[PDB]
Design an enzyme around this catalytic site. Structure first.
Site, PDB file in Angstrom:
ATOM      1  CG  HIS A 145      -1.010   0.461   2.512  1.00  0.00           C
ATOM      2  ND1 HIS A 145      -0.542   1.120   3.378  1.00  0.00           N
ATOM      3  CD2 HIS A 145      -0.862  -1.174   3.138  1.00  0.00           C
ATOM      4  CE1 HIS A 145      -0.753   0.484   4.628  1.00  0.00           C
ATOM      5  NE2 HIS A 145      -0.536  -1.339   4.280  1.00  0.00           N
TER       6      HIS A 145
ATOM      7  CG  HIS B 248       3.361   5.486   5.328  1.00  0.00           C
ATOM      8  ND1 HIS B 248       3.182   5.447   7.240  1.00  0.00           N
ATOM      9  CD2 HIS B 248       2.366   6.306   5.453  1.00  0.00           C
ATOM     10  CE1 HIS B 248       1.853   5.943   7.676  1.00  0.00           C
ATOM     11  NE2 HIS B 248       1.741   6.781   6.606  1.00  0.00           N
TER      12      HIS B 248
ATOM     13  CG  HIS C 298      -0.522   8.467   2.066  1.00  0.00           C
ATOM     14  ND1 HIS C 298      -1.490   7.139   2.139  1.00  0.00           N
ATOM     15  CD2 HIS C 298      -0.111   8.894   3.706  1.00  0.00           C
ATOM     16  CE1 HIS C 298      -1.363   6.636   3.426  1.00  0.00           C
ATOM     17  NE2 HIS C 298      -0.513   8.219   4.579  1.00  0.00           N
TER      18      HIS C 298
ATOM     19  CD  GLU D 222      -4.055   9.630   3.299  1.00  0.00           C
ATOM     20  OE1 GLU D 222      -3.488   9.610   4.610  1.00  0.00           O
ATOM     21  OE2 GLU D 222      -4.736   8.617   2.902  1.00  0.00           O
TER      22      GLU D 222
ATOM     23  CG  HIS E 249       0.938  10.122   6.826  1.00  0.00           C
ATOM     24  ND1 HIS E 249      -0.283   9.755   7.170  1.00  0.00           N
ATOM     25  CD2 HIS E 249       0.618  11.563   6.645  1.00  0.00           C
ATOM     26  CE1 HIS E 249      -0.807  10.140   5.760  1.00  0.00           C
ATOM     27  NE2 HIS E 249      -0.540  11.427   6.478  1.00  0.00           N
TER      28      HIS E 249
ATOM     29  CB  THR F 260      -5.083   7.818   6.742  1.00  0.00           C
ATOM     30  OG1 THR F 260      -3.689   7.518   6.390  1.00  0.00           O
ATOM     31  CG2 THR F 260      -5.358   9.418   6.767  1.00  0.00           C
TER      32      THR F 260
END
Ligand SMILES: O=C(CCCCCCC(=O)Nc1ccccc1)NO
Ligand SMILES: [Zn+2]
Length: 258
Positions: free
Chosen positions: A62, A92, A94, A104, A117, A196
């Site tokens: 992911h 990590h 996104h 996000e 994050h 999230t």
């Protein structure tokens, strides 16, 4: 089937397996800068990362994450809106398929190219599995990435991504200093929210930094070459692994700055 970011298993489907997806303190949110309240009672953040010990980098299907030794108070977050000591566990990202999407959180509806994050857990609960069951269990520092000049402190991460291209791959990743990922200013917004990703637990104090960091187009392009799939499966590029903004409901976003 299993959750992900595709048309058939993406964020709009998650509530079927994780009904808290429609809960009262879900993340991310849009930060409306004109309705956020300045709170002079909020303390400066204290980020103590000098003794951080990174362990491994892993593609979990992911995102990719860098894990830290959290068996002692080596890298901790204190202050701000927090009561107590929170240990750094992992970071990590996104990111998007294009530079105009990927974060996000949004700021006045503006999307950034990516969002970092840094995940910390409250040491009073003893381990991270217990912390995720508590309303003040985690504190996540969110940092926006904009495309511009390169971030030299990120290059060690970019250069190892070829080694963890597919789901389940991991590599040793020692002596990485997360201080190289922080902006100059630690001004922030904060609000109570959730993970999230599934299981979407409502255990997070979010601390979102106002100042983005700048990364180069070549650095972010390397994130988009990762794969959601495992070695041997149809290739699906790991892009757009972000959840859309959720309703604020009965929450107030507070600002550390005027
Ligand atoms: O939700 C987020 C930010 C917070 C991520 C929290 C992950 C916690 C972790 O790495 N370990 C863990 C997960 C579940 C239960 C216990 C520990 N981003 O998607
Ligand atoms: Zn995240």
């Amino acid at each position: 089937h299993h959750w992900g970011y595709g048309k058939h298993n993406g964020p709009e489907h998650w509530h079927k397996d994780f009904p808290i997806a429609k809960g009262e303190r879900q993340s991310p949110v849009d930060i409306d800068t004109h309705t956020a309240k300045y709170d002079p009672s909020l303390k400066p953040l204290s980020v103590s990362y000098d003794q951080a010990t990174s362990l491994r980098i892993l593609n979990n299907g992911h995102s990719f994450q860098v894990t830290f030794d959290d068996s002692q108070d080596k890298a901790v977050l204190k202050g701000g809106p927090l009561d107590g000591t929170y240990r750094l566990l992992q970071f990590h990202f996104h990111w998007g398929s294009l530079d105009g999407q990927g974060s996000e959180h949004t700021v006045d509806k503006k999307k950034y190219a990516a969002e970092l994050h840094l995940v910390h857990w409250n040491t009073k609960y003893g381990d991270v599995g217990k912390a995720v069951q508590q309303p003040d269990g985690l504190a996540v520092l969110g940092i926006f990435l904009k495309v511009g000049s390169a971030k030299p402190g990120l290059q060690k991460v970019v250069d190892v991504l070829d080694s963890i291209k597919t789901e389940g791959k991991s590599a040793d990743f020692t002596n990485f200093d997360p201080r190289g990922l922080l902006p100059e200013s630690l001004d922030y917004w904060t609000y109570p929210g959730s993970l999230t990703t599934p299981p979407l637990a409502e255990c997070v104090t979010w601390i979102v930094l106002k100042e983005p960091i700048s990364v180069s187009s070549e650095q972010v392009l390397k994130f988009r070459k990762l794969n959601f799939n495992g070695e041997g499966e149809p290739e699906e590029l790991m892009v757009d692994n972000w959840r859309p903004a959720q309703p604020l409901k009965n929450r107030q976003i507070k600002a550390s700055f005027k």
